[PDB]
Amino acid sequence: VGQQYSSAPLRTVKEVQFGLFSPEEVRAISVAKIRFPETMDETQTRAKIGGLNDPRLGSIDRNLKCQTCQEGMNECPGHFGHIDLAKPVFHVGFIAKIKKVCECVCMHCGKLLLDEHNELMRQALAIKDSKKRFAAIWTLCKTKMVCETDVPSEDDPTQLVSRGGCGNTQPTIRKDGLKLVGSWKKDRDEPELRVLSTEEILNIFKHISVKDFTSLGFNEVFSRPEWMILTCLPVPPPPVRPSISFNESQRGEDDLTFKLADILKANISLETLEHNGAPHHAIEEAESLLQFHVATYMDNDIAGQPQALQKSGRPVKSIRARLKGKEGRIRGNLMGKRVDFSARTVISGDPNLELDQVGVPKSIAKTLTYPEVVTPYNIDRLTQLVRNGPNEHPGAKYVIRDSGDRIDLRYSKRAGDIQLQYGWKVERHIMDNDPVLFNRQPSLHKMSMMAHRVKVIPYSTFRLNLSVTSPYNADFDGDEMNLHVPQSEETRAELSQLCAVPLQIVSPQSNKPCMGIVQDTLCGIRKLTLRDTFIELDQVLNMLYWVPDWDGVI
Partner DNA sequence: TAAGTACT
Partner DNA sequence: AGTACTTTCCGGTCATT
Q: Is 79 annotated as a binding residue?
A: yes
Nearer to RNA, 14 or 326 (CB): 326
Tell whether residue 480 is a contact of RNA (CB under 7 A). Answer: yes
User: Which one of Mg ion, RNA, another protein, none interacts with residue 487, CB within 5 to 8 A by kind?
Assistant: another protein
Tell whether residue 165 is a contact of DNA (CB under 7 A). Answer: no
User: Which of 42, 301, 489, 520 is close enough to bind DNA by CB under 7 A?
Assistant: 301
Residue nearest to Mg ion according to CB distances in the complex = 477
How far is it, in rounded angstroms, from Cα 244 to Cα 257? 12
Q: Is 147 annotated as a binding residue?
A: yes
Tell whether residue 511 is a contact of another protein (CB under 8 A). Answer: yes
Least separation in angstroms between residue 440's CB and Mg ion is 11
The angle formed by the CA atoms of residues 446, 450 and 451, to the nearest 5 degrees, is 145
How far is it, in rounded angstroms, from Cα 474 to Cα 214? 57
User: Which one of Zn ion, Mg ion, DNA, none interacts with residue 109, CB within 5 to 8 A by kind?
Assistant: Zn ion
Choose the stretch contacting RNA; rule: CB under 7 A; options: 4-12, 443-451, 472-480, 528-536.
472-480
Nearer to DNA, 433 or 441 (CB): 441
User: Which one of RNA, Mg ion, DNA, none interacts with residue 167, CB within 5 to 8 A by kind?
Assistant: none
Give long-range contacts, CB 8 A cutoff, 24+ apart: 143-151: 144/113, 144/114, 144/170, 145/169, 145/170, 145/171, 145/172, 145/185, 146/170, 147/106, 147/108, 147/109, 147/113, 148/113, 151/115, 151/117, 151/118
H or E, element range at 288: helix 288-296
331 to 350: interface string for another protein, x by CB under 8 A: x-xxxxxxxxxxxx------
How far is it, in rounded angstroms, from Cα 385 to Cα 425? 12
CA 444 to chain centre: 23
Least separation in angstroms between residue 364's CB and Mg ion is 23
Tell whether residue 441 is a contact of RNA (CB under 7 A). Answer: yes
301-330 positions binding RNA, by CB under 7 A? 314, 317, 327
Q: Is 393 annotated as a binding residue?
A: no
Residue 449 · residue 437 · CB < 8 Å? yes
Q: Is 301 annotated as a binding residue?
A: no
Nearer to Zn ion, 166 or 535 (CB): 166
Tell whether residue 453 is a contact of another protein (CB under 8 A). Answer: no
244-263 positions binding RNA, by CB under 7 A? 244
Read off the DSSP letter of residue 239.
G
Tell whether residue 442 is a contact of DNA (CB under 7 A). Answer: yes
30-69 positions binding RNA, by CB under 7 A? none
38 to 77: interface string for another protein, x by CB under 8 A: -----------------------------xxxxx---x-x
User: Which of 93, 165, 325, 524 is close enough to bind DNA by CB under 7 A?
Assistant: 325
User: Which of 442, 478, 548, 552 is close enough to bind another protein by CB under 8 A?
Assistant: 442
Residue 385 · residue 429 · CB < 8 Å? yes
140-199 positions binding RNA, by CB under 7 A? none
Q: Is 106 annotated as a binding residue?
A: yes
Crossing angle of helices 95-102 and 198-206, rounded to 10°: 60
Q: List Cα–Cα distances, 468 to 356, 361, 464, 480, in angstroms.
A: 8, 19, 7, 15
Provide the 10 A C-beta neighbour count for residue 96: 13
> How crowded is the C-beta side of 261, counted as CA atoms within 13 Å?
12
Spell out the residues 6+ positions from residue 197 whose beta carbon is closer than 8 angstroms to its own.
Answer: none
Tell whether residue 413 is a contact of DNA (CB under 7 A). Answer: no
Tell whether residue 176 is a contact of Mg ion (CB under 5 A). Answer: no
Least separation in angstroms between residue 314's CB and DNA is 7
Q: List Cα–Cα distances, 105 to 20, 230, 347, in angstroms.
A: 21, 20, 67
Spell out the residues 6+ positions from residue 33 whose beta carbon is closer than 8 angstroms to its own.
Answer: 50, 55, 81
Least separation in angstroms between residue 331's CB and Mg ion is 28
Tell whether residue 336 is a contact of DNA (CB under 7 A). Answer: yes
Read off the DSSP letter of residue 380.
H
User: Which of 154, 155, 189, 477 is close enough to bind Mg ion by CB under 5 A?
Assistant: 477
C-alpha torsion sign, points 59, 64, 67, 71: positive
Least separation in angstroms between residue 326's CB and DNA is 6
Candidates 531, 504, 528, 500; CA nearest to 516 is 504
Least separation in angstroms between residue 519's CB and Mg ion is 16
How far is it, in rounded angstroms, from Cα 438 to Cα 452? 7
User: Which of 283, 298, 302, 316 is close enough to bind another protein by CB under 8 A?
Assistant: 298
- Residues at the contact surface with DNA, assessed by CB under 7 A: 301, 303, 312, 325-326, 336, 344, 441-442
- Residues at the contact surface with Mg ion, assessed by CB under 5 A: 477
